[PDB]
RNA sequence: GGCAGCCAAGGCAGAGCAUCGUUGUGUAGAAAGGGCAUGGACAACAGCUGAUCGUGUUGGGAUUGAUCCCGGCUUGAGGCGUUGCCCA
RNA sequence: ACCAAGGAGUCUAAGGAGCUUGCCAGUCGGAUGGCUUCCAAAACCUUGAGGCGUGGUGAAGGCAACUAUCCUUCCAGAUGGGGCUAGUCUCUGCAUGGAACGACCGGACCCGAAGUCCAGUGGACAGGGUUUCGAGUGCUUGCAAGGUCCUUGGGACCCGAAAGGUGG
RNA sequence: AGAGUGAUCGAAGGAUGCAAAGAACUCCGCGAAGAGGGUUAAAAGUCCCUGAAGCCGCAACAGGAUCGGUGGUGUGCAGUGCUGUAU
RNA sequence: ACCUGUUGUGGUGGAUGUCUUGGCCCAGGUUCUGAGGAAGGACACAGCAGCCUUGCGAUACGUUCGGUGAUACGCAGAUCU
């Protein structure tokens, strides 16, 4: 299938997993991760005002 | 990017911007610059005004 | 004996670190910038159901 | 994040330029104060207004100047006190002018417009 | 070296024919420039006897005299007095052309400073 | 901070999009004398290399 | 050099082959899509010879099969003879040497649980793991040192 | 025309595919030895200053020790146009000088620990020039994770190891390309 | 300031391969011969203007 | 490929310089061989521009070639270009 | 028919083989955690499980790479040493290829299970032989990132069926 | 907008100018236009930034039976530039 | 005269260049409709209005009130400092 020594596939994509014009898709893409990341920060230290004078 | 290859990457910078026949080369003028690397009192970690700056 | 780095604007001399000692790697430094220029990028797509 | 309202988006910039009402192209038609009124009241710029004087400093009729007798805010111009032009009959039709060109020789200071000058004035 | 190059060297350039695309002359979207045939029975690609010049390596002209104009000189595009000043060493060898958009106020100055310098502008007489 | 061309920086996180920007390397650095003092220990440099001449 | 001068293009081949009709596909046998299958398909008809050739034991099952196969269980990282008096501070292998105190190797401190006996000892030291090959027993007793089953 | 013959092109490399400038100042150095010294062993380090990085590979201080084995190379020095990396399986060292290209902090160490030196090559080309007394060893590049799948495995008498992408099996009876043409059991099994 | 005694061939690699300026990392630009003698006159630490200025001594 | 008889040149070590030798067809295909060119990011040119940008049109010059530069005219900016590198 | 503008090998998961770079028996660790008007969703940091590698072999029960001065052997072979001589001898022996192993690890046979031993329910190994197998070891050739050419799943270089289905 | 009884399908279409200063008045004509004369930096003239190619009109010049062609080649003859140019 | 050509010019044509109150994409927040009548659909409503309006409903391009503070505007017409 290759013409080579290349392994065999086994590649597990064959079932709509791609957003095109018919498919929603399977894909979630987490571009939020920095944003998130300095979300739960502030959050978290929302919550140490919050129940301030005890551990966080 | 690894994080020991970002590290040399700016080790490298830094001896580049201490050789001043390449802080020219990238076109700055040297024409008053005393020394090359340029340091500074920390007294002016303490400044306020633009025009001190 | 490393090299003495005068001061501006006060008379000091301090030594030279030895950061400025290590290897010119002008490859190693435009790789890395190349690639570090790349995670500030946000994503631009076209509209799924375009041209459909 | 950038916080809200001091964006610095050219698209959302020109839109509110364009779409602005009469109440917001009111203060962004305002003019510059001479340097008489500004050492008077100690105010920099305020927002032009009918009836009081002003110097072109701009434009083809630079160094002129009379009283402002329309703010025609729709079209951003100003038109003064007898900067005209004829038409291609003899009617006579006035100019309109960016208020950012001329400066302010005169108020006519109503009562909301002392109190304006005041509360700009204070100096803070 | 501030050598310009001699009339003798000129003339023994090695006459690059006017290459053209083949059938560039039949239609108006097929342009004049080159283009190396890919066709299957392009006789053109084939090089059958009466045909025109195929572009080739064979046709290049020697260090000396490739890229220098019938001045005799090689051409520089200047539009500072900072690069009449690098041309100042070489007024023999390179002229200097003024860029297209550089504007008759400085063209101008060019044209002072060169003169002085004693370096040819191909393009002096252009705006005033 | 609205000077031009100034960038700033602090030596606990030096940002190579400042020490080389472009990919150019050989840019102009002031540093104050305590930043100085940091470099290598922030860096954690303990040696010079040995480089061929 | 001039090599280095040319840190150019993104897509060599591709923005190569612009010009050049079949795009380095060929005029005769085209470019089509799946003209042999789709993944592994045909591999004990037309890419029978391709599956013998790199891939033997294909095609096939062997072995008793494990419902629910716990790994945890049966985790188990080896180290040898030969890696264990780097585990040793050396002042205690030098006070250690010739007298009869053994140091103590605690193999799970660093990660490992069976103790495997290829590679010479050189001096006996006392190893504490889950489980050792008897080879590794045998070097560790001749040098003098013990093995010990530790939970 | 002419029947020709095969028109000579050089196999050897002579241009340091290495990026890094100071590899390509010592391409420089060896070059300048090769040529107005003129030693095999100039010669040999500038081929390896050439090298590629798969055909310099690491070398341990394990074949440093056993280079230097033999009581003849008592002042030696070992010399690896490679990465030096320490095995730990080494234990005691005897002292060595010992030129490379980059010696890991453990090979350093484990080096400077006996008494030995850790060179490189501009100083060893300062301190024999001629590259007397100098042990040149490579280091292997069989034992390759690439090399021992070069081949086919269902060839006879070839010992491939089968290419398997990113799938180690747990259970090893039920590995993934173990069956047919792996025991005479599923109807035969590749040669040995 | 003898922060690094850099060889020619890595100071020219420098330049040539991360300082993006026609007039000294192309060849055969009609300001390479004096640009090069220019920067290397400024490695060695003084450039002419034939007095010699002082020129940041690294 | 500076440790050179001297100047001139070269002076980017996969570069350059000097001498000599060999060999030049090519479909499919290839090149870790070399370049032209387009949009934009990061940088450099204290780059150009109302003393007229860009487009276009017409002549000229350069190039083996991809293509590049310039003069004239249109046109008038709600501007443009050169180099390195990166994202297409 | 003519001209203009558009127009076709792309991105992604996994992988292969080169090349580049960093580190090294380690390497990477941007799941997450610490910081600091916009820039900054960046940069920096080693809290990091874990991934890959360090051991393989057996269906499995499981077992697990000899060598106490150093060193597996042989053939070819890169360097280098010491004598010597324009005859020219010894020592070193890398890489690579081939062969071998009186070697060893795991599996499979045959004759046996003699012999030693004990965390002692009689259990643990042990000996000698084989036309034996392993994707085995014999001084661990690893990890990560980038790049090139590709593979397979994906619309999959672009366009192209007659068809099949669901609901109206 | 439009199409289809319907379920549905579904376009083309941006830019005067700094300012309307959007072309006064005159001649001719039924009138539109046109010729003048104006606005304006400019008609940029409500078709309005620029205005390519293809195609067409006109004037000038050069030729005109023949695949004896387009194109190539080496000259020539007319027209037309460009570069250099000794005493 | 016709044809072919080359220029100049004038038309037809809308390519180019430059921009853009538009889109697309990512991140954050909210999700807040309705029998007290929603979402949608009609017919109405402007001195000169056909269309459009996330305009409006016989109080019909709007009513009360607040913030602002001299306009709005394509014409006119009385209110307004």
Redesign the pocket.
Same mark, same amino acid.
């Given at each position: 299938?290759?013409k !080579?020594?290349?392994?065999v596939?086994?590649? #597990?994509? #064959?079932k #709509?997993?791609?957003p095109?014009?018919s498919q929603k898709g399977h894909v979630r893409?987490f571009?939020?991760? !920095?944003?998130?990341?300095?979300?739960?920060?502030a959050r978290?230290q929302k919550k140490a005002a919050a129940v301030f004078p005890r551990p966080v | 990017?690894?994080?020991?290859?970002?590290?040399?990457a700016?080790r490298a910078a830094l001896a580049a911007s201490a050789i001043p026949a390449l802080v020219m080369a990238?076109?700055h003028?040297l024409e008053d610059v005393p020394e090359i690397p340029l340091v500074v009192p920390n007294s002016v970690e303490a400044l306020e005004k633009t025009k001190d700056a | 004996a490393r090299p003495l780095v005068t001061v501006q604007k006060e008379g000091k001399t301090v030594p030279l670190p030895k950061v400025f000692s290590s290897a010119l790697?002008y490859?190693?430094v435009?790789?890395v910038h190349?690639?570090?220029?790349?995670?500030?990028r946000?994503?631009?797509?076209?509209?799924?159901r375009?041209g459909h | $994040?950038?916080?809200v309202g001091?964006s610095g988006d050219?698209?959302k910039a020109?839109?509110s330029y364009?779409?602005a009402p009469?109440?917001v192209?009111?203060v962004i038609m305002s003019a510059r104060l001479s340097k008489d009124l500004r050492q008077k009241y100690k105010v920099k710029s305020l927002?032009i207004?009918?009836e009081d004087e002003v110097k072109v400093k701009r434009?083809?009729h630079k160094g002129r100047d009379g009283k $402002?007798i329309?703010?025609?805010?729709?079209?951003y111009?100003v038109h003064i006190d007898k900067i005209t032009?004829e038409?291609?009959?003899?009617q006579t $039709?006035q100019?309109?002018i960016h208020p950012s060109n001329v400066e302010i020789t005169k108020l006519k200071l109503?009562k909301?417009?002392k109190k304006?000058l005041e509360t700009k004035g204070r100096r803070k | 070296?501030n050598r310009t190059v001699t009339?003798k060297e000129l003339k023994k350039?090695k006459?690059?024919?006017?290459?053209?695309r083949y059938q560039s002359?039949?239609?108006?979207?097929?342009s004049?420039?080159?283009?190396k045939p890919?066709g299957?029975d392009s006789a053109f690609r084939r090089?059958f006897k009466? @045909?025109?010049?195929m572009?080739?390596?064979? @046709?290049?002209?020697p260090k000396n005299?490739?890229?220098?104009?019938?001045?005799?000189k090689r051409?520089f595009?200047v539009?500072?007095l900072?690069d009449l000043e690098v041309l100042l060493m070489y007024n023999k060898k390179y002229a200097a052309?003024?860029?297209?958009?550089?504007?008759?106020?400085?063209r101008?100055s060019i044209v002072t400073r060169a003169k002085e310098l004693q370096i040819?502008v191909?393009?002096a007489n252009?705006?005033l | 901070?609205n000077l031009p061309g100034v960038d700033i920086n602090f030596v606990?996180?030096?940002?190579?999009?400042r020490l080389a920007?472009?990919?150019?390397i050989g840019r102009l650095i002031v540093f104050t004398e305590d930043a100085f003092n940091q470099l290598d220990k922030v860096l954690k440099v303990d040696t010079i290399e040995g480089l061929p001449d | 050099?001039?090599?280095?001068?040319?840190?150019?293009?993104? =897509?060599?081949?591709?923005?190569?082959?612009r010009g050049?009709?079949?795009?380095? =596909?060929?005029?005769?046998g085209?470019?089509?899509?799946?003209a042999?299958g789709?993944?592994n398909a045909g591999g004990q008809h037309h890419h029978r010879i391709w599956m013998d050739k790199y891939h033997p034991?294909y095609f096939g099952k062997?072995?008793?099969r494990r419902f629910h196969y716990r790994l945890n269980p049966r985790f188990?990282?080896?180290t040898?003879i030969?890696?264990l008096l780097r585990l040793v501070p050396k002042e205690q292998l030098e006070a250690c040497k010739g007298k009869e105190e053994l140091p103590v190797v605690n193999l799970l401190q660093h990660g490992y649980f069976?103790l495997?006996?290829?590679?010479?000892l050189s001096q006996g030291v006392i190893v504490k793991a889950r489980?050792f090959?008897?080879?590794?027993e045998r070097?560790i007793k001749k040098a003098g040192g013990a093995c010990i089953?530790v939970a | 025309?002419?029947d020709?013959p095969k028109?000579?092109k050089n196999k050897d490399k002579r241009?340091?595919?290495?990026?890094?400038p100071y590899?390509?100042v010592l391409?420089?150095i060896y +070059?300048?030895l090769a040529? +107005?010294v003129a030693?095999?062993?100039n010669?040999?380090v500038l081929k390896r200053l050439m090298k590629?990085?798969?055909?310099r590979?690491?070398?341990?201080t394990? &074949?440093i020790?056993?280079?230097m084995?033999?009581p003849?190379?008592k002042d030696?020095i070992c010399v690896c146009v490679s990465?030096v990396?320490?095995?730990? &399986?080494?234990l005691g060292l005897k002292p060595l000088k010992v030129c490379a290209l980059?010696f890991? %902090?453990?090979?350093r160490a484990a080096i400077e620990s006996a008494g030995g030196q850790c060179l490189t090559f501009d100083q060893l080309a300062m301190i024999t020039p %001629?590259?007397?007394?100098?042990?040149?060893?490579?280091? %292997?590049?069989?034992? +390759?994770?690439?090399? %021992?799948?070069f081949g086919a495995?269902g060839v006879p008498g070839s010992?491939?190891?089968?290419?398997?992408?990113?799938r180690?099996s747990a259970?090893?009876? &039920? &590995?993934?390309?173990?069956a047919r043409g792996?025991?005479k059991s599923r109807a035969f099994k590749?040669k040995? | 300031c003898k922060a690094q005694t850099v060889d020619?061939?890595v100071l020219?690699?420098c330049i040539?391969?991360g300082t993006?300026?026609?007039a000294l990392?192309?060849?055969?630009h009609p300001a390479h011969?004096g640009a090069?003698?220019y920067i290397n006159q400024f490695h060695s630490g003084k450039v002419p203007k034939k007095a010699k200025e002082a020129k940041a001594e690294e």
């Amino acid at each position: 299938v290759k013409k !080579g020594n290349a392994p065999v596939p086994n590649a #597990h994509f #064959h079932k #709509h997993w791609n957003p095109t014009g018919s498919q929603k898709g399977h894909v979630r893409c987490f571009f939020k991760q !920095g944003p998130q990341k300095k979300i739960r920060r502030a959050r978290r230290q929302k919550k140490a005002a919050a129940v301030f004078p005890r551990p966080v | 990017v690894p994080r020991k290859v970002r590290r040399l990457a700016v080790r490298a910078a830094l001896a580049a911007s201490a050789i001043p026949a390449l802080v020219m080369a990238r076109g700055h003028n040297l024409e008053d610059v005393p020394e090359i690397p340029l340091v500074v009192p920390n007294s002016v970690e303490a400044l306020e005004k633009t025009k001190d700056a | 004996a490393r090299p003495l780095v005068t001061v501006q604007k006060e008379g000091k001399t301090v030594p030279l670190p030895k950061v400025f000692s290590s290897a010119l790697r002008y490859d190693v430094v435009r790789f890395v910038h190349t690639n570090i220029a790349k995670n500030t990028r946000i994503p631009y797509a076209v509209s799924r159901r375009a041209g459909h | $994040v950038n916080k809200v309202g001091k964006s610095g988006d050219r698209r959302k910039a020109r839109k509110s330029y364009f779409t602005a009402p009469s109440h917001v192209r009111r203060v962004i038609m305002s003019a510059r104060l001479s340097k008489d009124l500004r050492q008077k009241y100690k105010v920099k710029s305020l927002p032009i207004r009918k009836e009081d004087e002003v110097k072109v400093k701009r434009g083809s009729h630079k160094g002129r100047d009379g009283k $402002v007798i329309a703010c025609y805010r729709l079209k951003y111009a100003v038109h003064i006190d007898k900067i005209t032009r004829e038409k291609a009959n003899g009617q006579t $039709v006035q100019i309109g002018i960016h208020p950012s060109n001329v400066e302010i020789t005169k108020l006519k200071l109503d009562k909301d417009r002392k109190k304006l000058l005041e509360t700009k004035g204070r100096r803070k | 070296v501030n050598r310009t190059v001699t009339r003798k060297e000129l003339k023994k350039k090695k006459h690059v024919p006017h290459f053209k695309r083949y059938q560039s002359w039949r239609h108006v979207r097929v342009s004049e420039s080159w283009r190396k045939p890919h066709g299957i029975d392009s006789a053109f690609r084939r090089r059958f006897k009466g @045909y025109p010049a195929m572009v080739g390596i064979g @046709y290049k002209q020697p260090k000396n005299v490739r890229h220098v104009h019938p001045d005799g000189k090689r051409q520089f595009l200047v539009h500072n007095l900072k690069d009449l000043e690098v041309l100042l060493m070489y007024n023999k060898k390179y002229a200097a052309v003024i860029g297209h958009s550089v504007g008759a106020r400085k063209r101008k100055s060019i044209v002072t400073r060169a003169k002085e310098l004693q370096i040819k502008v191909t393009n002096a007489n252009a705006r005033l | 901070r609205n000077l031009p061309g100034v960038d700033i920086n602090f030596v606990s996180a030096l940002n190579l999009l400042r020490l080389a920007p472009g990919g150019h390397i050989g840019r102009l650095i002031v540093f104050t004398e305590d930043a100085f003092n940091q470099l290598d220990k922030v860096l954690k440099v303990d040696t010079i290399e040995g480089l061929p001449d | 050099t001039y090599r280095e001068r040319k840190n150019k293009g993104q =897509h060599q081949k591709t923005r190569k082959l612009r010009g050049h009709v079949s795009h380095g =596909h060929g005029r005769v046998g085209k470019h089509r899509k799946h003209a042999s299958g789709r993944g592994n398909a045909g591999g004990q008809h037309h890419h029978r010879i391709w599956m013998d050739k790199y891939h033997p034991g294909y095609f096939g099952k062997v072995g008793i099969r494990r419902f629910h196969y716990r790994l945890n269980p049966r985790f188990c990282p080896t180290t040898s003879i030969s890696r264990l008096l780097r585990l040793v501070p050396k002042e205690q292998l030098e006070a250690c040497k010739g007298k009869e105190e053994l140091p103590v190797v605690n193999l799970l401190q660093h990660g490992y649980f069976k103790l495997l006996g290829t590679g010479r000892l050189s001096q006996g030291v006392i190893v504490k793991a889950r489980s050792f090959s008897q080879g590794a027993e045998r070097k560790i007793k001749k040098a003098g040192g013990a093995c010990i089953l530790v939970a | 025309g002419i029947d020709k013959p095969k028109q000579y092109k050089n196999k050897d490399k002579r241009h340091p595919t290495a990026t890094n400038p100071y590899i390509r100042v010592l391409v420089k150095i060896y +070059r300048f030895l090769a040529r +107005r010294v003129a030693t095999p062993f100039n010669k040999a380090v500038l081929k390896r200053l050439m090298k590629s990085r798969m055909w310099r590979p690491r070398i341990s201080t394990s &074949r440093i020790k056993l280079a230097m084995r033999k009581p003849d190379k008592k002042d030696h020095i070992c010399v690896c146009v490679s990465h030096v990396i320490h095995d730990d &399986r080494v234990l005691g060292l005897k002292p060595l000088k010992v030129c490379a290209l980059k010696f890991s %902090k453990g090979a350093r160490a484990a080096i400077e620990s006996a008494g030995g030196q850790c060179l490189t090559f501009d100083q060893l080309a300062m301190i024999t020039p %001629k590259g007397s007394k100098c042990v040149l060893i490579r280091g %292997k590049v069989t034992r +390759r994770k690439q090399y %021992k799948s070069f081949g086919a495995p269902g060839v006879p008498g070839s010992h491939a190891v089968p290419k398997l992408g990113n799938r180690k099996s747990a259970l090893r009876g &039920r &590995r993934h390309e173990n069956a047919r043409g792996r025991r005479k059991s599923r109807a035969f099994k590749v040669k040995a | 300031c003898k922060a690094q005694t850099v060889d020619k061939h890595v100071l020219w690699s420098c330049i040539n391969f991360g300082t993006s300026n026609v007039a000294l990392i192309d060849p055969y630009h009609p300001a390479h011969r004096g640009a090069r003698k220019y920067i290397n006159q400024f490695h060695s630490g003084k450039v002419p203007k034939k007095a010699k200025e002082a020129k940041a001594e690294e």
